[model samples]
Target: GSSGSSGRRVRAILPYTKVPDTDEISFLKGDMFIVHNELEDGWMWVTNLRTDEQGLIVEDLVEEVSGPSSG
Candidate 1:
């Protein structure tokens, strides 16, 4: 099995509003997330830094960050 967490930082490129039917984190643009793994169904297992909540998020909604985050 893979590791539980990757400890990689990612930044939200687009905002996502949570839908009642799904278990996804609702984040605004520029929000930071810690990526754990990529799902086969195009979702990302992540923890939102701003809210300290973990959930699956759309893969296209975020981009991996390189240096230290500014916001």
Candidate 2:
């Protein structure tokens, strides 16, 4: 639904860099998230597809997925 999830997928990538913020998500690799919005400086708000957890993630850390994320 537009009120929350837009179903825009992103591949959950392991952070090569250290955790930088509290709003950042710590999800397992291969997890898919529904994108909510994008912020300036490349922060994106997304919701985990499985558990419905929401948080901010880097726009580059997760690549947009089409069908299913292969990890």
* Top candidate (lDDT): 1
Compose the digit string of candidate 2's lDDT tens values, residues 1-71: 34655457787776434267666667777778877786679887788776677888777778866556564
- Expressed as tens digits, the lDDT of each residue in 1-71 for candidate 1 is 76476477788898888888777778989889888876777887889989999899877788878857774
* Cα TM-score of candidate 1: 0.76
Error of 2 at 5 (Å): 11
- The list of candidate 1 runs beyond 4 A from truth reads 1-5, 67-71
lDDT of each: 0.82, 0.71
**What's the alpha carbon RMSD for model 2?**
4.4
